[PDB]
Write an enzyme that holds these catalytic residues in place. Structure first.
Site, PDB file in Angstrom:
ATOM      1  N   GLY A 192       3.209   5.381  10.323  1.00 50.36           N
ATOM      2  CA  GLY A 192       4.550   5.102   9.838  1.00 50.36           C
ATOM      3  C   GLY A 192       5.151   3.774  10.282  1.00 50.36           C
ATOM      4  O   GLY A 192       6.279   3.464   9.878  1.00 50.36           O
ATOM      5  N   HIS A 231       0.807  -1.209   0.000  1.00 56.71           N
ATOM      6  CA  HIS A 231       0.000   0.000   0.000  1.00 56.71           C
ATOM      7  C   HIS A 231       0.849   1.272   0.000  1.00 56.71           C
ATOM      8  O   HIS A 231       0.287   2.373  -0.120  1.00 56.71           O
ATOM      9  CB  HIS A 231      -1.008  -0.016   1.146  1.00 56.71           C
ATOM     10  CG  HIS A 231      -0.428   0.153   2.518  1.00 56.71           C
ATOM     11  ND1 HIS A 231      -0.481  -0.840   3.476  1.00 56.71           N
ATOM     12  CD2 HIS A 231       0.130   1.229   3.116  1.00 56.71           C
ATOM     13  CE1 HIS A 231       0.055  -0.392   4.598  1.00 56.71           C
ATOM     14  NE2 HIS A 231       0.427   0.865   4.409  1.00 56.71           N
ATOM     15  N   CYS A 243       4.216   0.845   9.367  1.00 53.45           N
ATOM     16  CA  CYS A 243       4.023  -0.235   8.414  1.00 53.45           C
ATOM     17  C   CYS A 243       5.359  -0.749   7.894  1.00 53.45           C
ATOM     18  O   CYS A 243       6.316  -0.002   7.685  1.00 53.45           O
ATOM     19  CB  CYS A 243       3.115   0.211   7.252  1.00 53.45           C
ATOM     20  SG  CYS A 243       1.421   0.267   7.840  1.00 53.45           S
TER      21      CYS A 243
END
Ligand SMILES: *[C@@H](O)[C@H](C[C@@H]1CCNC1=O)NC(=O)[C@H](CC(C)C)NC(=O)OC[C@@H]1CCC(=O)N1CCC1CCCCC1
Ligand SMILES: *[C@@H](O)[C@H](C[C@@H]1CCNC1=O)NC(=O)[C@H](CC(C)C)NC(=O)OC[C@@H]1CCC(=O)N1CCC1CCCCC1
Ligand SMILES: [Ca+2]
Lengths: 298, 301
Positions: A141, A39, A143
Site C-alpha cells: 500500500g 499499476h 505505492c
C-alpha cells in the site's frame, strides 16, 4: 550527527487515496491533477505482463475513486505519462505548494513521505543508489508515496514509489513516470545492477565525524586523485570527480583537511578496516549523507 | 538491516510553531489553542543566565514585552505565567491549525520525532531516543530552543519534549510540555554532567524480536531467567535494568513471535556473557538500542 528529513507538511497536504477495483494506493494532488502509479489499473492477472495502453483505454473516469480525507474528488479526465497516471479532478488543492518536478542524480538524497491509504505515516531520508534503487521502508500500500527536497518554500518532487525487489530494496520513478534504473512495472522478481558506494558522500560523512571531534581515522599520508580512484574502483566505490573535490571545499576549509588528505584516510579504511572501532556510532562507512546534507547540519 | 530511524510526518507540528522574542533573544514557541508555550529562559539576559531568579525576572515582565510571531505576523499576548521551566503566553487568537493533542511525559528508551526549528521556521525532522541518563542526541544549534519532540497516534499529537540546552559532552536536555526537566538538569548557563549512560535493554530486546520476525534466530535458546537475575547481570554490562513497564511493552512482540519476554532475556544474557563470536544479527555485530517495540512493529507490519 544523524539523518534529517525535510519537514513534510507541504507534501502531507497533497496526499490522497486512489482506488481502482480492489487496488488502493496513494496519489499526489497538485492544483487540479492527481498523480499516481499506473499499476493501480492492473488486476492480479494483468500484473504479470500488463499492456497499460490497452488497460487504460478500457477504463472510464468513474472507475477511479479518489478520496481526500472523507471527501471524494470527481475524476473528470485521465491520461498516462510513462508509468504515472494523471487524473484531472473537479477540485483544486488549495494546499498546493510552490513545486517543481526534478529528476535526481545517483548519490543525491531526498526525503520520503511514506503513506498508506492516502494517510502520511513516516518521513525519512533516502539516497538514490548508484544502481538506481533506494533502501526504503515501504510496505504493501505504500505505492504513490513520494520523495522530495525543499528549497526555500519550493518543493522539488523527485520520486514516486512503485515496487520492491527480492533483496528488499525499492524502485520507482520520477514524477514524469520514468523509472530510475532498469526496472519495469510488472509483477516479476527483478534484480538491480551491482551496487557501489557513493564516495563523495562517505567523504562528507568523515568530515562530519571530524567536526564532531572524531579523528582517529585521519592520517598524515596523502594520495593523488587518480591513485585514490584506482583503489576506490577496486572496492566498488564510485569515482570521485574534480567537481566532487570542489564540492567538498567548504567542509575542507572548515576542518583544515585537504580533500585528498581525507581520501587517503578513506583509502586506509578500505584497506585496513575499522579494527572494531566505530565512526559516528557506525561500524560501517555511511554513504547517504551528501556534502550539502552535512553543512545544513554542520 | 532493513530498519531505519523513521520520524512522524511533521505537518501537524509545523502548523503550531511560532517565535517568541524578548529583546534580542528569539527562540521557538508552540501555539496550541490560545496559548504559546516556550522555554522560560527567553526572559533571561546574558547577565541573568548563570543563575537567573526567574520569579523576579517574570515580575518585571509585562504582556507587551513579549513579541510572539507566526512568520512575520504578530500575535498579541494577553496574559503570561510560568509553569516549572516553561513560559505560557496567553494570546488573543486561537491557533486554527491546532491538532488533537496531549502532553505526555515519556520514559527513558522511548523514541520521538524532533522538529528542529530556528526563528519559528522548521529546518528538519528526525527521530531521537531518550537515553537512560535523560539526555538526547539531537542536532540542536543556537536558536533551536523551544523546538519540540512528539509522537503521533491516529492524528493525535503527543508532545513529549521541548528543547532547552546542550551539555558539555554535546548531548541535549530539556523538559516535557509542563516544564519539568527530564533528568536532574536545571535551566542555568552552568556545566552539568549527565550520568554515565547505559544501553537501552528494552530496545535491544525489541531488536532481537525484530531479528526473529525476519528469520534471524540463531541466538534463541531453550532456557529462561527471572527478571531479577537478568537485571543483576545486565548492570554488570552497563545495560539498563528492566522495569515491569518494559516487560509490558514487549508483550505485542512476544505474542507475535511466541517467545516469552523472560526467554528472550535469557538469550540476551547469553549474548552479553559470551558475546557474538563473530556472528551478526540483522547484518550487524552491534546490538541496536534506539528502536522501541513500537518502532519495530511499525516497520515490520
Ligand atoms: C505498491 O502497489 C506496491 C509496493 C510494494 C509492496 C511490498 N513493498 C513494496 O514496496 N508495489 C507493488 O505491488 C508492485 C506492483 C508491480 C510493479 C506491478 N510489486 C511489487 O512491489 O512486488 C514486490 C514483490 C516482493 C518481492 C518480489 O520479488 N516482488 C516482485 C513480485 C513477485 C515476484 C515473485 C513471484 C510473486 C510476485
Ligand atoms: C537555546 O536557547 C539554546 C540551545 C543550545 C545552543 C547550542 N546548542 C544548544 O542546544 N540553549 C542555551 O543557550 C542554554 C541556555 C541556558 C539553559 C539558560 N545554554 C546552553 O545550552 O549552554 C550550552 C553551553 C555550551 C556547552 C555547555 O556545557 N554549555 C552550558 C553552559 C556553560 C557554557 C560555558 C562553559 C560552562 C557551561
Ligand atoms: Ca514544580
Amino acid at each position: 550527527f544523524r539523518k534529517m528529513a525535510f519537514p513534510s507538511g507541504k507534501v502531507e497536504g497533497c496526499m490522497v487515496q486512489v482506488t481502482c477495483g480492489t487496488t488502493t494506493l496513494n496519489g499526489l494532488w497538485l492544483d487540479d491533477v492527481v498523480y499516481c502509479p499506473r499499476h493501480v489499473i492492473c488486476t492480479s492477472e494483468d500484473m504479470l505482463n500488463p499492456n497499460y495502453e490497452d488497460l487504460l483505454i478500457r477504463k472510464s473516469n468513474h472507475n477511479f475513486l479518489v478520496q481526500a480525507g472523507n471527501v471524494q474528488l470527481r475524476v473528470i479526465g485521465h491520461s498516462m505519462q510513462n508509468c504515472v497516471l494523471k487524473l484531472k479532478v473537479d477540485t483544486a488543492n488549495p494546499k498546493t505548494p510552490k513545486y517543481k518536478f526534478v529528476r535526481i542524480q545517483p548519490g543525491q538524497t531526498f526525503s520520503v513521505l511514506a503513506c498508506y491509504n492516502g494517510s502520511p505515516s513516516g518521513v525519512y531520508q533516502c539516497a538514490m543508489r548508484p544502481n538506481f534503487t533506494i533502501k526504503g521502508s515501504f510496505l504493501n500500500g505504500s505505492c504513490g508515496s513520494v520523495g522530495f527536497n525543499i528549497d526555500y518554500d519550493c518543493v522539488s518532487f523527485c520520486y514516486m514509489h512503485h515496487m520492491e525487489l527480492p533483496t528488499g530494496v525499492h524502485a520507482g520513478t520520477d514524477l514524469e513516470g520514468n523509472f530510475y534504473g532498469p526496472f519495469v512495472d510488472r509483477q516479476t522478481a527483478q534484480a538491480a545492477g551491482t551496487d557501489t558506494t557513493i564516495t563523495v558522500n562517505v567523504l562528507a560523512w568523515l568530515y562530519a565525524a571530524v567536526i564532531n571531534g572524531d579523528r582517529w581515522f585521519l592520517n598524515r599520508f596523502t594520495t593523488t586523485l587518480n591513485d585514490f580512484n584506482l583503489v576506490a574502483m577496486k572496492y566498488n566505490y564510485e569515482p570521485l570527480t574534480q567537481d566532487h573535490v570542489d564540492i567538498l571545499g567548504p567542509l575542507s576549509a572548515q576542518t583544515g583537511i585537504a580533500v585528498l588528505d581525507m581520501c587517503a584516510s578513506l583509502k586506509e579504511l578500505l584497506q585496513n578496516g575499522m579494527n572494531g572501532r566505530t565512526i559516528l556510532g557506525s561500524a560501517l562507512l555511511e554513504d547517504e549523507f551528501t556534502p550539502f546534507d552535512v553543512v545544513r547540519q554542520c
